[PDB]
Every structure is written in structure tokens, then in C-alpha cells.
Amino acid sequence: KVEKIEFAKLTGERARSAGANGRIGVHGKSCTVDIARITIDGQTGYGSSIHMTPEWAEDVIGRRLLDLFDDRGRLREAYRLQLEYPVLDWLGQRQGKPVYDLVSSLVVPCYDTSLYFDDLHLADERAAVALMQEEAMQGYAKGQRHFKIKVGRGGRHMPLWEGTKRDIAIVRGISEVAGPAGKIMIDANNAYNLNLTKEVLAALSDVNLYWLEEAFHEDEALYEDLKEWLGQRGQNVLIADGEGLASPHLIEWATRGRVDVLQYDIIWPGFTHWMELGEKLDAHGLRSAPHCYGNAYGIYASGHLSAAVRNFEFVEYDDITIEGMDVSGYRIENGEIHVPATPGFGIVFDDELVTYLINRSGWS
Amino acid sequence: LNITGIQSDWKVEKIEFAKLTGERARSAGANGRIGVHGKSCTVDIARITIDGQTGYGSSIHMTPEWAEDVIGRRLLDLFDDRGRLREAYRLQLEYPVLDWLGQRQGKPVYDLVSSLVVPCYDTSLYFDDLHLADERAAVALMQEEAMQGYAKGQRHFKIKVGRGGRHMPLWEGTKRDIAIVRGISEVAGPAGKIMIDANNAYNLNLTKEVLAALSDVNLYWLEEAFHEDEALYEDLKEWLGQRGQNVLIADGEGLASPHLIEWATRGRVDVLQYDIIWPGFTHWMELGEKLDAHGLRSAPHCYGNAYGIYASGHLSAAVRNFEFVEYDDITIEGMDVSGYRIENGEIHVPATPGFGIVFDDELVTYLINRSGWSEGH
Numbered sequence: 001k002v003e004k005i006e007f008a009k010l011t012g013e014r015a016r017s018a019g020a021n022g023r024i025g026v027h028g029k030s031c032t033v034d035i036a037r038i039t040i041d042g043q044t045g046y047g048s049s050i051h052m053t054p055e056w057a058e059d060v061i062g063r064r065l066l067d068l069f070d071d072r073g074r075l076r077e078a079y080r081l082q083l084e085y086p087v088l089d090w091l092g093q094r095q096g097k098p099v100y101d102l103v104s105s106l107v108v109p110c111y112d113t114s115l116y117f118d119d120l121h122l123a124d125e126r127a128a129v130a131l132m133q134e135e136a137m138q139g140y141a142k143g144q145r146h147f148k149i150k151v152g153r154g155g156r157h158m159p160l161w162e163g164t165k166r167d168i169a170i171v172r173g174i175s176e177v178a179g180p181a182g183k184i185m186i187d188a189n190n191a192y193n194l195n196l197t198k199e200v201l202a203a204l205s206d207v208n209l210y211w212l213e214e215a216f217h218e219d220e221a222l223y224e225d226l227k228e229w230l231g232q233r234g235q236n237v238l239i240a241d242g243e244g245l246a247s248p249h250l251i252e253w254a255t256r257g258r259v260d261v262l263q264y265d266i267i268w269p270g271f272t273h274w275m276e277l278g279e280k281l282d283a284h285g286l287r288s289a290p291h292c293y294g295n296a297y298g299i300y301a302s303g304h305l306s307a308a309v310r311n312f313e314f315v316e317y318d319d320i321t322i323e324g325m326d327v328s329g330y331r332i333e334n335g336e337i338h339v340p341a342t343p344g345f346g347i348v349f350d351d352e353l354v355t356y357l358i359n360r361s362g363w364s
Numbered sequence: 365l366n367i368t369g370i371q372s373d374w375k376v377e378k379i380e381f382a383k384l385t386g387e388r389a390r391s392a393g394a395n396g397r398i399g400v401h402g403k404s405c406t407v408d409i410a411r412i413t414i415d416g417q418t419g420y421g422s423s424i425h426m427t428p429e430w431a432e433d434v435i436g437r438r439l440l441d442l443f444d445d446r447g448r449l450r451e452a453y454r455l456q457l458e459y460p461v462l463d464w465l466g467q468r469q470g471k472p473v474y475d476l477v478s479s480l481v482v483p484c485y486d487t488s489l490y491f492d493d494l495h496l497a498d499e500r501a502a503v504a505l506m507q508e509e510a511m512q513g514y515a516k517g518q519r520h521f522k523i524k525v526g527r528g529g530r531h532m533p534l535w536e537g538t539k540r541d542i543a544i545v546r547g548i549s550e551v552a553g554p555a556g557k558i559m560i561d562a563n564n565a566y567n568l569n570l571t572k573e574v575l576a577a578l579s580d581v582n583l584y585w586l587e588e589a590f591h592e593d594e595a596l597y598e599d600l601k602e603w604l605g606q607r608g609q610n611v612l613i614a615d616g617e618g619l620a621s622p623h624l625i626e627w628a629t630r631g632r633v634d635v636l637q638y639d640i641i642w643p644g645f646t647h648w649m650e651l652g653e654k655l656d657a658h659g660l661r662s663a664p665h666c667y668g669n670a671y672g673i674y675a676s677g678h679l680s681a682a683v684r685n686f687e688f689v690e691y692d693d694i695t696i697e698g699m700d701v702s703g704y705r706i707e708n709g710e711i712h713v714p715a716t717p718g719f720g721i722v723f724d725d726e727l728v729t730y731l732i733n734r735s736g737w738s739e740g741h
């Protein structure tokens with residue numbers, strides 16, 4: 001039986017302040033994670049929690065844990081967003097198993113997602129390249145080998161042609177810092193159209209472009225055309241899409257071969273959702289790369305999830321430090337994240353700090 | 365609607381389905397995102413029989429098996445406690461049913477839901493110039509197309525732009541967009557409201573470039589510059605304000621953002637363009653009232669379905685901030701729309717029963733029996 005439910009926001013910081021992206025402004029350095037602490041049968045479990053009010057909590061207390069689940073042992077829709085993470089943790093805690101085992105040493109590819117438009121104050125290309133190269137080198141030093149570069153400078157934040165030229169310079173530049181083995185992804189946050197996309201792609205013929213992410217809002221006809229154009233020129237770049245307010249027909253479009261990599265968020269729709277979705281995508285030969293940005297907890301959940309998903313691509317990694325949330329069990333090495341074999345999600349929350357924050361700025 | 369006159373005795377006796385075919389006056393070319401649209405048109409139509417009387421209208425998402433389950437239900441059963449057509453029946457039967465009510469009461473639909481004269485615009489200016497290498501030849505052709513509309517009474521024009529997104533190189537395509545828009549503006553004169561529709565082929569900066577290049581022109585609205593985004597539209601609106609450039613932002617056709625109306629109430633989007641067939645007429649009656657309550661404008665999308673033009677006309681009586689009927693000149697066999705006429709940029713809607721469209725009973729019977737289907741007796 002669910003006995004108690006506690007809630008708290010935890011705070012910390014990104015290792016380096018994130019600049020603008022193709023569509024909006026500076027993302028900054030401050031980070032937060034909403035967490036719930038559940039208690040079932042005397043033992044506590046921790047995890048990401050969203051869409052949960054004290055009123056909502058009131059109406060769950062006393063419900064049999066068994067009642068939270070589906071026939072197929074799949075946490076029920078109504079509970080996922082608010083409790084799927086604390087529950088999974090609590091399960092792992094009780095059975096002393098890591099969630100990836102509950103859902104099956106674990107080693108997962110990851111990439112550095114922290115390369116935003118950090119060069120907008122610079123008139124000189126070389127200064128801008130050196131700056132972005134240096135940011136990439138910073139990730140390399142921490143064990144990153146793969147890099148997702150924000151592009152679309154010309155969409156909103158710089159003049160069109162100038163920003164596009166700058167996009168192409170930064171990506172090449174970073175291509176050189178990374179090495180031949182380094183996978184480069186580019187993410188335009190919808191700031192291109194099809195012909196801009198082709199211009200940028202053609203200019204990057206020599207670069208180890210692994211995938212193109214959100215070039216423009218997903219469109220079956222445009223992506224069909226783009227895949228053909230790419231095929232005709234022998235340029236091997238995957239089409240990635242799916243974060244945010246996605247087209248309701250996106251999965252369908254992927255099954256027809258217009259999109260290769262699906263990027264639904266690791267918190268919304270979340271973990272339980274991704275497990276079922278992951279199965280569907282494997283069956284179609286489609287790839288899974290759960291989006292994660294703005295929530296540090298998501299990085300580590302994505303890690304565990306790869307166990308449940310054959311065609312899992314990468315963990316999306318942003319170097320973040322949240323007070324009270326010990327993630328030292330995880331290590332970055334050679335373009336991969338090593339998930340600890342410890343109980344639950346392998347994350348060690350400081351019970352005292354959380355208890356304080358629960359009283360001060362949360363509820364129970 | 366006033367449903368007090370409906371007798372409990374009145375039942376759905378028969379539902380029949382046919383596809384009507386026809387042609388637009390001029391073949392439509394590509395738009396910013398896809399290829400040639402062509403000249404061929406169709407309209408899926410149902411004929412419903414209730415209490416021995418028939419009504420006709422657009423019908424989608426209806427199978428024989430669906431209709432089989434409606435036969436024998438009372439007309440009253442199709443309505444809410446609020447006198448609203450139930451959601452489950454709207455796409456399949458709202459048009460046949462509204463037409464029927466009009467036939468029974470001897471009233472046009474606009475009277476049921478309230479000489480009706482509604483602004484319209486000519487939507488037929490597609491990328492018809494893509495075979496012309498020369499910009500001057502392209503401008504001349506597009507002007508010619510606008511004047512064909514003008515000769516038939518159109519005064520306001522919606523111009524497809526976004527040539528550089530896919531079909532032409534980016535820079536050349538955008539130069540061409542601008543020249544085309546100026547050219548048509550010239551032809552339409554000061555009274556002409558000019559609309560531009562990018563079909564999502566621009567980004568924010570391309571949009572700004574085009575708008576600045578067209579500061580001169582009488583631009584009434586900018587439609588689907590890029591896929592709706594609150595942040596980008598907030599920026600665009602503020603940018604237009606500083607320039608004193610009075611152009612409305614229009615969006616909402618196709619698979620729209622679920623938050624679009626929310627963004628509109630916060631002032632990022634001015635004109636809402638949900639389609640006249642899906643989500644449909646009943647939906648629009650309720651939505652229009654909501655948009656009016658927020659001081660927002662309604663311009664139901666209609667393209668690919670001629671029937672929707674006439675529906676849009678009658679809907680206008682139910683919506684205070686109704687902008688325009690989106691007009692495409694189409695002839696559908698067996699669908700007599702001669703009660704309607706275009707004069708001085710307005711569509712005149714007939715005061716005749718139902719939607720005022722006279723279907724060829726015999727032709728429709730033939731199509732129903734040859735290629736369509738029938739349920740009931």
C-alpha cells in the first residue's frame with residue numbers, strides 16, 4: 001500500500017551556461033528537478049514527478065501498490081507522469097535490483113548536447129569557431145566523443161545568410177576538434193526550410209553527420225523529398241524528430257520511412273510510455289532517442305531505458321549538478337555513460353536535504 | 365439551432381452516399397510544400413431521408429456500417445440537451461441534417477443558426493509560374509490569373525508564396541514571391557485586400573525580409589509563414605508594431621498546434637483557420653462564439669472541397685468576426701450552385717431552403733447506385 005507522498009523541487013546548475021537556440025533565447029545555467037518521495041511498506045523511493053498536486057496526492061494514499069499497475073504489470077496511465085519514477089525506484093530498492101534489470105554491466109552511448117548559440121556576441125568567425133571548438137573540447141575532456149550542435153542561427157537571431165554561413169563554420173570547426181570517430185548531430189530547432197536544409201547539408205558533405213534533428217516542423221512530403229535527395233547524393237544522415245508538440249502522425253510517417261529516429265521526451269510522455277513505444281519501434285526497424293533537456297533526472301532514466309529498447313540510440317547528455325542528488329554512480333567514458341548496478345535508478349538522494357526542502361518549499 | 369419543431373415521430377429512414385466529381389476553372393499549381401494540385405475536384409455527399417423528405421450535404425468518415433447503425437433513430441436523438449448536434453454525428457451527417465432542417469422549415473441555414481452578403485477572396489493563385497524562367501513573364505502570368513478572378517467579381521486575392529522553400533532556389537524563389545505579390549497588388553488596386561500564404565515554407569527572418577520588401581502593398585494577412593510557434597509569432601507581432609506595418613497573422617489549417625487558440629488569446633495570432641469540413645460546421649458555430657468573445661477573427665479554411673465554400677457563407681451569420689469565404693471557382697457535376705453569385709468581392713448567398721444548393725436527384729441516384737451505397741428504405 002502507498003503510505004505517504006512527499007514533494008520537493010531540487011535546484012542546481014548546468015556546468016556551462018547555455019545560449020540561445022534557433023527559436024528562442026538564452027537558456028542559462030540555473031537547473032531544477034521536481035522530485036517525489038513515496039513510501040510503501042515502510043521503504044522510500046525517489047524520482048522525477050510532474051503534474052502532481054497535494055490534492056492529487058490525497059487521493060492516492062492508501063491505495064494498494066498492486067492497484068497502481070496494469071494487467072501486464074504496466075503502471076496505469078493515470079499514475080505515470082506523477083509517480084512512475086518514484087515507483088520504479090522503490091521497486092528496485094525493494095528487490096535490490098537496478099531498474100534496467102527490472103525492465104530488461106550496462107553501458108550506453110551518449111552525446112554532448114550543450115553546444116548552443118554561444119557565439120552570438122562575436123563578429124569574427126574564427127573567434128566564434130574557437131569558442132565553440134573550446135566548448136566541444138570541454139566535453140571531450142569529460143569523456144564525450146559525440147556532439148549535437150545547435151544550428152539555425154539565421155532563423156531568428158542573426159541575418160539569414162550570415163547566420164547560415166556561421167552555422168556551417170561552427171559545425172566544420174567542431175568536426176575538427178572531435179576527431180574522425182566523433183559523431184556529429186545538428187539540431188535546427190525548426191529554424192530551416194527544406195532548401196536551407198539542403199544547402200547546409202551539401203556544405204557539410206565531408207563531415208561525420210550522424211543525424212539531422214528538427215530541421216523544420218515535421219512534414220511527410222518534405223522529409224520524403226529530403227530522404228530522396230540525400231540518397232541520390234549518397235549522403236548518409238538520419239532524420240530525427242519528435243520532441244515538443246509533435247505531429248500526431250509522426251510515428252506513421254516514420255513507419256513509411258520518412259523519419260528514422262523518434263525523440264519523444266523521457267519525462268513526458270515518460271518512462272513507462274517509452275517502454276511500450278520502444279517495442280513498437282523496434283518491430284518497425286525504427287530507432288529510439290529519447291529527448292532530454294531541462295531535467296537532469298531524465299539523463300539517467302534514459303540510461304536505464306536502453307535495456308528495454310533494442311534500437312536505442314543515445315542518452316542526450318547535459319553536464320548538470322543538482323544539490324541533494326548524488327549521481328556519482330554514473331561515469332562518462334569514451335562516448336558512453338556507464339550506469340551503476342546499484343538498486344533502483346542508482347541515484348542517491350540526500351534524505352536530509354530533501355526532507356528540509358519538502359517542508360520549506362514542498363508538501364506531503 | 366431551434367429544435368422545438370422536431371417531432372419525435374421523425375426518424376432517419378435512409379442514408380445514401382456518393383462521390384460527385386468536377387473541375388476547377390483553372391488548374392492549380394504547386395504551393396510552398398507540395399506539387400501541382402491539378403484541375404480535378406470531388407465532393408463526397410450524403411443524401412439523408414427523414415419523414416419522407418431528403419437533405420443533401422458533405423459527408424466524411426462515414427461507412428455503410430456506420431450508417432446502418434443510425435437508420436431508425438429519431439432525429440431528436442442526434443441532438444444534445446443544448447440543442448447541439450452530437451459530436452458523434454457531425455462529420456458524417458451535420459450537412460445533410462442542416463440542409464434537411466432548412467428544407468423542412470423552408471428556411472436557409474443562415475436563418476436557422478443566426479439578403480446575406482459575405483466577403484470572399486480568390487484563393488486560386490498557386491505557383492503557376494514555375495515553368496517561366498523570367499521574373500517578368502512570371503509576374504505577367506500571375507497578374508493574368510488575378511484578372512481572370514477579377515472578371516468574375518473577385519476583388520480580394522490570396523497569393524501562394526514560399527517558392528524558395530522547395531520548388532525554386534531559396535534566394536531566387538523569394539525574390540520571385542515578392543515580385544509576384546507586388547504585381548498582383550498593382551492589378552487588384554487600392555480596394556483589393558491581398559493575403560499571402562507560405563504553407564510553412566518560410567522561417568522568421570525570411571518572413572521579415574518578405575514583409576519589409578512589401579511595406580508598400582495592401583497586405584491584409586500573412587498565413588502560415590511557418591508552423592505556428594508562440595515565441596516566433598510574439599517576435600513577429602512586436603516587429604510589425606515597431607514598423608507600423610498592419611498585417612494580421614493567420615493560422616490553424618491542417619494538423620494545428622493544440623495550443624493555437626491559447627496563443628491567439630494572448631495576442632500572437634489574429635485569424636483562426638480551422639477547416640469548414642473538419643472539424644466542421646457545428647464545431648465552428650461553437651468555436652466562432654468563443655473567438656468572438658476574445659475579439660479574435662474567424663476565417664474557416666476551405667480547399668479541396670467545393671461544398672465548403674457555400675457552407676462557409678451560411679456560417680458567417682453565426683459568427684460576428686467572420687472574415688472571408690475562401691473561394692475556389694469549381695464546377696461539380698450535379699451540384700447546382702447558381703443561387704450563389706460573386707459581385708464586388710462578395711458572395712451573395714440565396715435565401716432559399718437549406719444550403720440553397722440544388723442537387724441533381726437523378727444523377728446522384730445514379731452515382732449512389734453505380735459507385736456509392738445505400739442504407740435504409
Ligand SMILES: [Mg+2]
Nearest residue numbers: 187213214243
Ligand atoms: Mg532538439
Ligand SMILES: [Mg+2]
Nearest residue numbers: 214218241242
Ligand atoms: Mg519536430
Ligand SMILES: [Mg+2]
Nearest residue numbers: 561587588617
Ligand atoms: Mg493556407
Ligand SMILES: [Mg+2]
Nearest residue numbers: 588592615616
Ligand atoms: Mg499552421
